[PDB]
Amino acid sequence: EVLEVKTGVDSITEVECFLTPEMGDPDEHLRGFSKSISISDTFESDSPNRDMLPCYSVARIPLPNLILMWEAVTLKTEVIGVTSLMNVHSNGQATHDNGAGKPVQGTSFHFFSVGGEALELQGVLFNYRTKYPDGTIFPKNATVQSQVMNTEHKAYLDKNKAYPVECWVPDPTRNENTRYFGTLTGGENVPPVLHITNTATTVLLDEFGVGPLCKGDNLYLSAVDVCGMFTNRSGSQQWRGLSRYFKVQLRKRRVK
């Protein structure tokens, strides 16, 4: 039972933060990058290293202690550091003789969610025989059906640096208390197109005028911003991610 919104000065609050990307971080200098990508010699021997796998980012944000629940009403969000991708001089692969370095480009996934509980995930595997590495949380008891839909693969995005992007998507059969948005753009030559502005707001209310309700006074923010790949001089390629800004406005809602 969702009842009335509380009003008055005390009745609203705001959460602001940045979620850093988790692209694999293969050494102490490579925060925001994955390990260079290697290709298995056969389909059945696919065995990616942990540091080669971008993962979902998640933050649980504590809210002012309050039945009243905080209701998330609006979101401003954008990718932070878009202009860093203009560094075309840091030992990249020249576009042609005497040219500048190739910029970050290729397959991207840009995703964010705001919810009153952890994002609920459904597993789908490109190749069910992929051996996922220690330190990741991946679909278990994979079968050939996992390549299209195996309803056994349910999870909560409840840990950082853990749930690989390629194994998991938001579960559309759940997530009633979350609003999620994502775009996959695939292809090795896809250009990043990244917009920034402090004038754009997304409303998180459903068709009944109710936003995510924050259980235990916690707000869940999740993101992925794989921008593409950086190509080194040698031709090796690494995923590159960037952080995402969130500003969420919340109001006190009475519930029964």
Added chain:
Amino acid sequence: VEVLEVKTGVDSITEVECFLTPEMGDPDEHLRGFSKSISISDTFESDSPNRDMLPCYSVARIPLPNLNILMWEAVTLKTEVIGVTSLMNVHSNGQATHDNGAGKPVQGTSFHFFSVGGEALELQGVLFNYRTKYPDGTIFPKNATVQSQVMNTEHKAYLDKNKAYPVECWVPDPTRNENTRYFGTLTGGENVPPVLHITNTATTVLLDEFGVGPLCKGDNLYLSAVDVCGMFTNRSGSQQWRGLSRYFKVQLRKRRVK
């Protein structure tokens, strides 16, 4: 059928929620969601695709709570492609984009399609090449002539079976389908990027201009889909179609008819 009032009350609404798996060909026990690698005939008349090389339309007939004249009326749809991020696996015996590079991602010709109706989707056959010999186990335009390459009105069918109706020879029949709402996009070209959006905040309203949605004959709801995302290229250069499942959530209400 005269369409009369909508029934109200707690009893008057129901939801259907499900996923339709893709039917891309499934050439062996490890390759669910993929087709056989594509081979090319040497002439038009020798085009003889194997069944497991042909993506087919997916269909589900969903029984609804029995009525009875009341009919369930489909009012809204939420839908999306499930597993979009799986296409980020660029390390599983793909063809390197260049020396030392990552594997080429799934890309190229795609068809994304879905429909919700109160009866089977009605199909019209159109053939790229009327001399194509379609394989046993598929249902395809019969008595094809050269006119079948542009329009032959003999080729009518119902999407009434799974793993049967090849995508490439059938489309929704625009002269029929009064009791279905359908939506599709073909994006052709060997290098087209998949652009796949997901969100739980988007709803499609299924009502026509008179405020009437599909009416479920015999208390059955028909959901149909194709989500050929593109082709996967193996190390050898061979290419296979790759498809993904589609989620449907449909809200229905009871409607009286006479």
Added chain:
Amino acid sequence: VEVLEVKTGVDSITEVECFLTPEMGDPDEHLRGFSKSISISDTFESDSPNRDMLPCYSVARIPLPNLILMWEAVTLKTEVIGVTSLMNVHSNGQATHDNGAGKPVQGTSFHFFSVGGEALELQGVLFNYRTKYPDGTIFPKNATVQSQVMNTEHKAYLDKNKAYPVECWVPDPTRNENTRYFGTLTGGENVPPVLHITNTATTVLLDEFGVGPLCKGDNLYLSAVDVCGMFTNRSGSQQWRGLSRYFKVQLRKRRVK
């Protein structure tokens, strides 16, 4: 003419539903919907395309129930029929790369449709005024170099099928008061077809005064071109490929003076 009131009642509306087949050239008895392989002239002066290499505008004149009252075209639903046929990448096509699938239809496309109460009015514009157009086509006559940009002599009516080459003629924007036309040229050898289908989309044909095309002599004119791109066979030769277009038009009776 003064346009007056719309008639009402059961008898006052009618509907036209049909398809227009493409006219791409049809170079032999197996290649309906395709053109002849494209050949290139050595010079502008030697450009001499054969008839079966030239896509043409499609047109249908549809008689309406006999009726001063005129039928007024109010709405249109339209789509390209057979879009999924372009997924046949296994039929004598040039491979994308070694061991790869066949190339799909792609490259230059023209998608066009019109609904009018009389024939579509055409204006001729020539890429190359020295092109010798073939017998059996209807093309701009007395062409001069000015025909490459605008020669007002080249006026015609789209009044015959398999006759008016697409590359020679466009809708005349200076006329066509009694037609609604819509078209997009997307040029380039690698452009991807993007073809949408749905039975939920309607185009309203009324102008800014609330008046649709009025059907002179109780004839409705439908015109289309749907050159989807080119098919490349294993030799590398390329042919235009077209598809049919569905039309459903709702009409109502209108009094005029």
Added chain:
Amino acid sequence: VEVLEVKTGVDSITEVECFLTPEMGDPDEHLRGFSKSISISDTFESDSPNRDMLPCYSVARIPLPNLNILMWEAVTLKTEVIGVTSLMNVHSNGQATHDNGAGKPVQGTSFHFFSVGGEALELQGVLFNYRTKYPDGTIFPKNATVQSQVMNTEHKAYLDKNKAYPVECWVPDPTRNENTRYFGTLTGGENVPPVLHITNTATTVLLDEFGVGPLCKGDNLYLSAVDVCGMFTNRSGSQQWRGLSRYFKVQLRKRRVK
């Protein structure tokens, strides 16, 4: 001026319909609508384009019915590029896309621009390379300096002559042009596809935020255009700009002013 009421009555309105032809260079008696083949200087400093290699802005000054204080106010515009299908001629001395293939279509850098005003379009000069030597017979930014490569406010002109103002060194002056409405898109890149839409159902309203359109000084309407569609590549690989004409229909009404 003080803008007062609009006149009404049958003869309070008039229409202008015409077309503007492109001025691409016209290098010989057979090549109207094309430029000369494009060549490239050996140094930045030696850039010296031929007149016939430089597309120019098109302009027409259209006399309106004599009024006298009343002025014609331009209210709406319909406009269209004329001859878009001509670009389907891929069989006329073109460079084949690959062995045995069709000719390459017109593609690459385009500039599509149109304006409607009650006086000549006001131009600001900006030079890619301030040391470019512009040819006799063109009107170009004079006394160019390195600052002309980004902004030199000395370079002001009126679009008041045809075959004169090269496209590449002039743009509409956004600091002026209060009595004109202008619209343009530059799409740059050697493989850019032309995307040209035609319809007689699209109208642009020319009224500003105060409900006032361009007011035609001396009963003259000014129409300006550029429609460089891309480049045509011939068999040798050499490239020429190709332009097309633009149709304009403008509706005007009588406005009292003081």
Added chain:
Amino acid sequence: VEVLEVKTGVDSITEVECFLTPEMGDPDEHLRGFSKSISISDTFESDSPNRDMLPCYSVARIPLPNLILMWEAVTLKTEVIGVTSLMNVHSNGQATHDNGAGKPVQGTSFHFFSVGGEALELQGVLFNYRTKYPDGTIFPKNATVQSQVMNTEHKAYLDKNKAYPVECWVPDPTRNENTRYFGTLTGGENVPPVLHITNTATTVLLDEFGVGPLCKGDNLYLSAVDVCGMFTNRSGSQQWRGLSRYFKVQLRKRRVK
């Protein structure tokens, strides 16, 4: 500060019109609007771009009529000036193919503008934290590996021209309450510039409460980046090319307490 009513009367509005020139590096006396040609470091760790190879943010502080009342920015018209200059494909560029025209400016672009009542607030993000940024630039200091994703130490104001490298800094979304900013990064070596011009488009600068940027000390801050892409020289060497941006801002007097 409490925001109260807008003042009316003829005296109550003003307008600012200006252009901001690009700061791409200007490697010599002939190359205003271009950067130095781009060179690539031999190792990732040794990235060390020269100052004249780094485009920077442009900023102008514009004094307003001296006035508690404050000038409130309400609307903006803006566009890139000189878009057609990119049609110069004949000035010692690299031919796209044998006998072809020169490659146009293309590839990675950043188009950005802001209007505020105080300096734009910046947050630093580094592609490579071991990049040695050159003397004469203002760049994130005490860089660590966290600087490659988010190091909140890297805060700055866009308070100087020719100083803040584009690749190091973005608008700080956690600040800028009194600024409206808009930007698009389009990355990739072959992306085509798509540049629209028109004098008919207005951006409204009011927030959801109907309040625009309020100009502290009667100064308006305008900021811009218009890196259009790269020019490729005949040798293959590449230089960033930028263009100026026009701003017209309408302001009104607002009483505050």
